[PDB]
CSV table of C-alpha atoms in Angstrom, one decimal:
chain,number,residue,atom,x,y,z
A,1,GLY,CA,102.2,108.8,131.8
A,2,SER,CA,101.1,107.4,128.5
A,3,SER,CA,97.9,105.4,128.9
A,4,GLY,CA,96.8,104.4,125.5
A,5,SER,CA,94.7,101.4,124.3
A,6,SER,CA,93.2,100.2,121.1
A,7,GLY,CA,89.5,100.7,121.3
A,8,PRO,CA,86.7,99.2,119.1
A,9,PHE,CA,87.0,99.2,115.3
A,10,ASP,CA,85.0,101.8,113.3
A,11,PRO,CA,85.3,103.1,109.7
A,12,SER,CA,83.4,106.2,110.7
A,13,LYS,CA,86.2,107.2,113.1
A,14,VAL,CA,88.5,107.3,110.0
A,15,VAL,CA,89.0,110.9,108.7
A,16,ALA,CA,90.2,111.3,105.1
A,17,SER,CA,91.0,114.6,103.5
A,18,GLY,CA,93.5,116.5,101.3
A,19,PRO,CA,93.8,118.2,97.9
A,20,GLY,CA,93.6,114.9,96.0
A,21,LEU,CA,89.9,114.5,97.1
A,22,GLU,CA,89.3,118.0,95.7
A,23,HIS,CA,91.0,117.7,92.3
A,24,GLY,CA,93.7,115.9,90.4
A,25,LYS,CA,95.9,116.2,87.3
A,26,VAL,CA,97.3,113.6,84.8
A,27,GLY,CA,100.7,112.6,86.2
A,28,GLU,CA,100.2,114.5,89.4
A,29,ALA,CA,99.8,112.9,92.9
A,30,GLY,CA,96.6,113.1,94.9
A,31,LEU,CA,97.8,114.0,98.4
A,32,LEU,CA,95.5,112.2,100.9
A,33,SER,CA,95.8,112.1,104.7
A,34,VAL,CA,93.8,109.6,106.8
A,35,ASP,CA,93.6,110.6,110.5
A,36,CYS,CA,92.4,107.6,112.6
A,37,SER,CA,91.3,108.3,116.2
A,38,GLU,CA,89.0,105.6,117.4
A,39,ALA,CA,88.9,103.5,114.2
A,40,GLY,CA,90.6,100.8,116.1
A,41,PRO,CA,92.4,98.0,114.2
A,42,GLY,CA,91.9,97.0,110.6
A,43,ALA,CA,93.6,97.5,107.3
A,44,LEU,CA,93.2,100.5,105.0
A,45,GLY,CA,92.8,100.4,101.3
A,46,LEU,CA,91.9,102.6,98.3
A,47,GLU,CA,90.8,101.9,94.7
A,48,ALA,CA,91.0,104.5,92.0
A,49,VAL,CA,89.0,103.9,88.8
A,50,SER,CA,88.1,106.3,86.0
A,51,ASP,CA,84.7,106.4,84.2
A,52,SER,CA,86.6,104.6,81.4
A,53,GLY,CA,87.6,101.8,83.8
A,54,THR,CA,91.1,103.1,84.3
A,55,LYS,CA,93.0,101.7,87.4
A,56,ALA,CA,95.3,104.5,88.7
A,57,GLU,CA,98.4,103.8,90.7
A,58,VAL,CA,97.7,104.0,94.4
A,59,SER,CA,100.0,103.5,97.4
A,60,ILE,CA,99.5,103.6,101.2
A,61,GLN,CA,102.2,104.6,103.7
A,62,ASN,CA,102.1,104.7,107.5
A,63,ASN,CA,103.2,107.5,109.8
A,64,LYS,CA,104.5,107.8,113.4
A,65,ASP,CA,101.4,110.0,113.9
A,66,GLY,CA,99.1,107.1,113.4
A,67,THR,CA,98.0,108.4,110.0
A,68,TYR,CA,98.2,107.1,106.4
A,69,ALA,CA,99.6,108.9,103.4
A,70,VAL,CA,97.4,107.8,100.4
A,71,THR,CA,98.4,109.0,96.9
A,72,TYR,CA,97.1,108.4,93.4
A,73,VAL,CA,98.6,109.1,90.0
A,74,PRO,CA,96.0,109.5,87.3
A,75,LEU,CA,97.5,108.3,84.0
A,76,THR,CA,94.5,109.7,82.0
A,77,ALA,CA,92.3,112.7,82.7
A,78,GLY,CA,88.6,112.3,83.4
A,79,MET,CA,86.1,111.7,86.2
A,80,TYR,CA,87.6,109.4,88.8
A,81,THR,CA,85.9,107.3,91.5
A,82,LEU,CA,87.9,107.1,94.7
A,83,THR,CA,87.0,104.0,96.8
A,84,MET,CA,88.4,103.8,100.3
A,85,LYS,CA,87.7,101.0,102.8
A,86,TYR,CA,88.9,100.6,106.4
A,87,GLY,CA,88.7,97.2,107.9
A,88,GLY,CA,86.4,96.0,105.1
A,89,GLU,CA,84.0,98.9,105.7
A,90,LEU,CA,83.6,102.0,103.5
A,91,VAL,CA,84.5,105.3,105.1
A,92,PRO,CA,82.4,108.5,105.5
A,93,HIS,CA,84.8,110.1,102.9
A,94,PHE,CA,84.2,107.6,100.1
A,95,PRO,CA,83.4,107.0,97.5
A,96,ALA,CA,84.3,110.5,96.4
A,97,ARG,CA,84.2,111.7,92.8
A,98,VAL,CA,86.9,114.1,91.7
A,99,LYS,CA,87.4,115.8,88.3
A,100,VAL,CA,91.0,115.5,87.0
A,101,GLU,CA,92.4,117.9,84.4
A,102,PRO,CA,94.8,117.1,81.6
A,103,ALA,CA,98.6,117.6,81.9
A,104,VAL,CA,98.7,119.9,78.8
A,105,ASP,CA,101.2,122.7,79.1
A,106,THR,CA,101.0,125.8,76.9
A,107,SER,CA,104.7,126.6,77.1
A,108,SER,CA,107.4,124.1,76.3
A,109,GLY,CA,110.8,123.4,77.8
A,110,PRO,CA,113.8,121.0,78.1
A,111,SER,CA,112.4,117.5,77.4
A,112,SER,CA,114.5,114.7,78.9
A,113,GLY,CA,113.6,112.6,75.9
């Protein structure tokens, strides 16, 4: 007996977490998981922008668990400003500042070139 119904909309009900919201690296992908319980309908969206006005590549994917897989690839290191919005309303997990480190490696290896 599965009795489920779409309740009222609410951005507060949206729960966003993950390592991406803790830290990031140039070229890496900020793993972000959004667990919606009673957030009702509405569309999800995120906007990544660095202090130097740098728009990072962001994508949103849906899951059979009713969650969303948000990822961001910082092209340049520096302080980033994550901006999430659910149904046109900011979430309790944004904006969220995150310091991203450079993709500099001490040791070298086989470069595709």
